[PDB]
Enzyme design. Structure first.
Site, PDB file in Angstrom:
ATOM      1  N   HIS B  41     -12.790   0.353   6.947  1.00  0.00           N
ATOM      2  CA  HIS B  41     -13.587   0.853   5.807  1.00  0.00           C
ATOM      3  C   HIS B  41     -14.761  -0.047   5.450  1.00  0.00           C
ATOM      4  CE1 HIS B  41     -11.809  -1.978   2.898  1.00  0.00           C
ATOM      5  NE2 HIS B  41     -10.602  -1.576   3.257  1.00  0.00           N
ATOM      6  N   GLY B 143     -12.846  -8.141  -2.189  1.00  0.00           N
ATOM      7  CA  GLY B 143     -13.262  -8.992  -1.089  1.00  0.00           C
ATOM      8  C   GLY B 143     -12.127  -9.572  -0.273  1.00  0.00           C
ATOM      9  N   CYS B 145      -9.958  -7.878   1.523  1.00  0.00           N
ATOM     10  CA  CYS B 145      -9.619  -7.082   2.688  1.00  0.00           C
ATOM     11  C   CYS B 145      -9.927  -7.844   3.967  1.00  0.00           C
ATOM     12  CB  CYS B 145     -10.363  -5.753   2.648  1.00  0.00           C
ATOM     13  SG  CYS B 145      -9.601  -4.651   1.437  1.00  0.00           S
TER      14      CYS B 145
HETATM   15  C1  LIG Z   1     -10.920  -4.444   0.197  1.00  0.00           C
HETATM   16  O1  LIG Z   1     -11.548  -5.710  -0.017  1.00  0.00           O
HETATM   17  C2  LIG Z   1     -10.264  -3.913  -1.079  1.00  0.00           C
HETATM   18  C3  LIG Z   1      -9.127  -4.796  -1.610  1.00  0.00           C
HETATM   19  C4  LIG Z   1      -8.534  -4.177  -2.879  1.00  0.00           C
HETATM   20  C5  LIG Z   1      -9.515  -4.310  -4.052  1.00  0.00           C
HETATM   21  C6  LIG Z   1      -8.733  -4.983  -5.178  1.00  0.00           C
HETATM   22  N1  LIG Z   1      -7.451  -5.358  -4.598  1.00  0.00           N
HETATM   23  C7  LIG Z   1      -7.286  -4.863  -3.367  1.00  0.00           C
HETATM   24  O2  LIG Z   1      -6.259  -4.926  -2.714  1.00  0.00           O
HETATM   25  N2  LIG Z   1      -9.711  -2.594  -0.780  1.00  0.00           N
HETATM   26  C8  LIG Z   1     -10.315  -1.487  -1.211  1.00  0.00           C
HETATM   27  O3  LIG Z   1     -11.356  -1.544  -1.852  1.00  0.00           O
HETATM   28  C9  LIG Z   1      -9.670  -0.158  -0.890  1.00  0.00           C
HETATM   29  C10 LIG Z   1     -10.576   0.611   0.086  1.00  0.00           C
HETATM   30  C11 LIG Z   1     -11.227   1.653  -0.823  1.00  0.00           C
HETATM   31  C12 LIG Z   1     -10.511   1.726  -2.166  1.00  0.00           C
HETATM   32  N3  LIG Z   1      -9.570   0.615  -2.129  1.00  0.00           N
HETATM   33  C13 LIG Z   1      -8.690   0.257  -3.073  1.00  0.00           C
HETATM   34  O4  LIG Z   1      -7.894  -0.675  -2.903  1.00  0.00           O
HETATM   35  C14 LIG Z   1      -8.703   1.062  -4.355  1.00  0.00           C
HETATM   36  N4  LIG Z   1      -7.416   1.711  -4.502  1.00  0.00           N
HETATM   37  C15 LIG Z   1      -7.249   2.999  -4.244  1.00  0.00           C
HETATM   38  O5  LIG Z   1      -8.230   3.698  -4.023  1.00  0.00           O
HETATM   39  N5  LIG Z   1      -6.002   3.468  -4.257  1.00  0.00           N
HETATM   40  C16 LIG Z   1      -5.648   4.884  -4.197  1.00  0.00           C
HETATM   41  C17 LIG Z   1      -4.139   4.993  -4.338  1.00  0.00           C
HETATM   42  C18 LIG Z   1      -6.063   5.468  -2.849  1.00  0.00           C
HETATM   43  C19 LIG Z   1      -6.296   5.681  -5.327  1.00  0.00           C
HETATM   44  C20 LIG Z   1      -9.025   0.237  -5.618  1.00  0.00           C
HETATM   45  C21 LIG Z   1      -7.940  -0.795  -5.929  1.00  0.00           C
HETATM   46  C22 LIG Z   1      -9.185   1.172  -6.808  1.00  0.00           C
HETATM   47  C23 LIG Z   1     -10.336  -0.530  -5.487  1.00  0.00           C
HETATM   48  C24 LIG Z   1     -10.389   2.125   0.353  1.00  0.00           C
HETATM   49  C25 LIG Z   1      -8.953   2.649   0.197  1.00  0.00           C
HETATM   50  C26 LIG Z   1     -11.161   2.608   1.597  1.00  0.00           C
END
Ligand SMILES: *[C@H](O)[C@H](C[C@@H]1CCNC1=O)NC(=O)[C@@H]1[C@@H]2[C@H](CN1C(=O)[C@@H](NC(=O)NC(C)(C)C)C(C)(C)C)C2(C)C
Ligand SMILES: *[C@H](O)[C@H](C[C@@H]1CCNC1=O)NC(=O)[C@@H]1[C@@H]2[C@H](CN1C(=O)[C@@H](NC(=O)NC(C)(C)C)C(C)(C)C)C2(C)C
EC number: 3.4.19.12
Lengths: 306, 306
Positions: B41, B143, B145
């Protein structure tokens, strides 16, 4: 989000661990520039360590008595000296992996990471705190002596602890990197009293803020309280007193949550008098005191190092 | 003695962490030989993230769209490809710090260490478990991820986890290194929920053995039970079933303490039915299920790595 007992990355320290052998005693050493630091009771024997005379023992020694092993490379010892309870072995080779470092002596309440080692090699890394009775609750077996504790501030390793011995309550005692014990302990196998331990109140409040920042906000209440009336319930419950300095350190945490410090104290008061009623805070059923206000901020804002 | 959440030494992994930037998105990557692994992503725009078809953005990308910093040094990308949910960016330089490694997919109940990172820089290391519902209870901010989870045998890093996303209960979900999610999660912002968690019974028993090995003893009793009687209590209290394979794996620990597995079950049974009544086990007021029997043996026996 989430909140974990987090240790500093251990790479910069791993590159400094060596193995030190004298007689039939092996333990770990710390190699920085051309000096290897280790606990001085490496020079004792099993018969010695009932009440040794350490500078007697050291004057009977030669450089060649100390086998210093860095991986497979053997390290030539070219001098030695005793600084309080640590031995300083001068070697013929500066450690090319020497990080930028300091030696610091820490106060009770402050936390650090421990890299547990055996025969010069790392076993694991964990976090803990210098208790108010100057012990630490570590995990240390035979041969772990010489393992060090440390903090990392951006690029620079601050070493604060070298491991020396286990007390009969299962807790641990050691020195700073200048050989001076934390607390009233000595590196001799005679009767030693750990002293009764209190809970680090400023840290418990910090973790309560970590809980709020992470969505746990039961235990919050109406009330407020004065530092005097709070300090006066902390006395009952074996908590250490709260000072205005503690209040000020919790400022950033207080401002980021909108819960004033004396309000969170009123929550802690009420948690102490009533218990948790079967609930958990950050996955714990006890009040946790091994996170400083800094540990909370760095973990809930993601501060990094290099 | 003593018993703590111990993570593996993180040195071998720190030297693999890099920063990967595409568009406005920055996350961490894993650089081994001439390949950088990161979550796919990173190619999403903040509006794509609603329901992206990932082969879109990828065929629309060129090599120079990917900015990869290893420290200050920029790595030129000379190829890319997608394997399930991870990107593989081939770069023109093999990492000189590449440790011996494997990619493994762990099972629920197993534990590993996480090196949390931001902008390619290690921020901290902690231990945790793959929950029965294939979440992990981590600490991850924006950040983070691309941070990875790992184990170490003697000298080899087994990467088992790459971080992708946080679920709305505060827990975390990710993939193995080969791209495949643990659990039924997807890397889209569509409604998803963890699924009901259970307690890793075999791990609770291992931790009880660690407690005995360390002198916590108050929870033992006369009684024994059968595996079928115990499993009927485990089912009421939302505990995983205990298999005979679990019994066998607990053998070593059983032999070191002299307490039969089915004896330890009978006293877990009574802990579940009476609760703990004040008192603690290994500094905890809850039954801890994030230590495996391997974790207990290595920490109690002082296994090291190189
Ligand atoms: C990558 O760096 C981040 C790490 C996240 C952010 C805060 N803590 C973490 O673990 N991951 C993401 O940004 C992923 C990525 C986009 C949205 N996302 C999320 O983690 C979101 N959560 C969700 O969207 N969860 C549902 C259950 C799908 C609604 C969040 C926490 C709102 C930013 C994608 C999944 C592609
Ligand atoms: C050095 O590697 C070890 C590490 C110890 C061993 C197990 N856990 C540890 O932390 N340290 C020692 O062997 C030191 C060393 C000799 C005795 N010792 C101890 O830790 C002993 N403890 C005591 O004797 N404690 C009192 C309070 C002095 C009675 C122990 C645990 C019996 C081996 C000396 C202190 C020089």
């Amino acid at each position: 989000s989430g909140f974990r007992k987090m240790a500093f990355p251990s790479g910069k320290v791993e590159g400094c661990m060596v193995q030190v052998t004298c007689g039939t005693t092996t333990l770990n050493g710390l190699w920085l520039d051309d000096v290897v630091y280790c606990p001085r009771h490496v020079i004792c024997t099993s018969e010695d360590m009932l009440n040794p005379n350490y500078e007697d023992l050291l004057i009977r020694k030669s450089n060649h008595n100390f086998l210093v092993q860095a991986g497979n490379v053997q390290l030539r010892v070219i001098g030695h000296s005793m600084q309080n309870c640590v031995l300083k072995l001068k070697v013929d080779t500066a450690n090319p992996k020497t990080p930028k470092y300091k030696f610091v002596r820490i106060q009770p309440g402050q936390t650090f990471s421990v890299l547990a080692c055996y025969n010069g090699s790392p076993s694991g890394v964990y976090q803990c705190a210098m208790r108010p009775n100057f012990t630490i609750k570590g995990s240390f077996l035979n041969g772990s002596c010489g393992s060090v504790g440390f903090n990392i501030d951006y690029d620079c390793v601050s070493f604060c602890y070298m491991h020396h011995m286990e007390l009969p309550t299962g807790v641990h005692a050691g020195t700073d990197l200048e050989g001076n014990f934390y607390g009233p302990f000595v590196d001799r196998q005679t009767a030693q009293a750990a002293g009764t331990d209190t809970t680090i109140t400023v840290n418990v409040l910090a973790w309560l803020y970590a809980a709020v920042i992470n969505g746990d906000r039961w235990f919050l209440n109406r009330f407020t309280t004065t530092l005097n009336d709070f300090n006066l319930v902390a006395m009952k419950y074996n908590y250490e007193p709260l000072t205005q300095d503690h209040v000020d350190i919790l400022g950033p945490l207080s401002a980021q949550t909108g819960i004033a410090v004396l309000d969170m104290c009123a929550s802690l008061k009420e948690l102490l008098q009533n218990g948790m009623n079967g609930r958990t805070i950050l996955g714990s059923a006890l009040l946790e005191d091994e996170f400083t206000p800094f540990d909370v901020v760095r973990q809930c804002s993601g501060v990094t190092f290099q």
